[PDB]
Design a protein around this ligand. Sequence first.
Ligand SMILES: OC[C@H]1O[C@@H](O[C@H]2[C@H](O)[C@@H](O)[C@H](O[C@H]3[C@H](O)[C@@H](O)[C@H](O[C@H]4[C@H](O)[C@@H](O)[C@H](O)O[C@@H]4CO)O[C@@H]3CO)O[C@@H]2CO)[C@H](O)[C@@H](O)[C@@H]1O
Ligand SMILES: [Ca+2]
Length: 193
Amino acid sequence: RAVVEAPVEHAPIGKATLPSTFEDSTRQGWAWDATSGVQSALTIKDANESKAISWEVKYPEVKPVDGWASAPRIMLGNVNTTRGNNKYLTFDFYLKPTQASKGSLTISLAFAPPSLGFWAQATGDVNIPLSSLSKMKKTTDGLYHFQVKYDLDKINDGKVLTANTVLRDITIVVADGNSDFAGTMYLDNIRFE
Ligand SMILES: OC[C@H]1O[C@@H](O[C@H]2[C@H](O)[C@@H](O)[C@H](O[C@H]3[C@H](O)[C@@H](O)[C@H](O[C@H]4[C@H](O)[C@@H](O)[C@H](O)O[C@@H]4CO)O[C@@H]3CO)O[C@@H]2CO)[C@H](O)[C@@H](O)[C@@H]1O
Ligand SMILES: [Ca+2]
């Protein structure tokens, strides 16, 4: 299936780049998956004094049964990277809610390794409770700043990512955990470490 809307003015696609810093004002190869429930503009905005890729999302009040149907699902296609000696994939994730009071966001990471049936999913989903936020100190520019880590030795289905396993694509999903989130999200500094 494909989720479609009228043409939207994304920032320039650029070229797949890791670490993804967005400093060249392009998306450095990141784009919505064709199945992403969110297909609105991906742009390059300042977040916490750095350029970051960004979108808006307000999850529906009536929640789909499939837990990713409404989710931003952003992908770095055909990067063809490997983890090397790195234990983690990590990135900066920022929120600027207009509404956030209940439920959670559940952030997943996946890869498409051609040797592993084009899917390998990190086991360590990260949940951000929205009631936790009001008590969190914001950045100077009014954001909630998370640095999210995924231990690449914890992968579902017994699949193993070795130092040399080709990762064709990287996917990040920000799923709705029965939440009332509305507002802006941002990614920066997407990298292995
Ligand atoms: O639905 C929510 C549920 O999702 C689970 O993850 C699903 C994904 O939602 C789904 O998009 C993903 O589909 C993959 C599939 O696994 C790959 O095998 C397939 O690979 C393609 C490849 O991309 C092509 O280039 C190649 O030519 O063909 C191969 C084989 O078809 O690509 C599709 C699309 O990326 O499958 C996931 C695992 O089932 C989550 O695991 C779960 O947590 C969520 O709740
Ligand atoms: Ca940046």
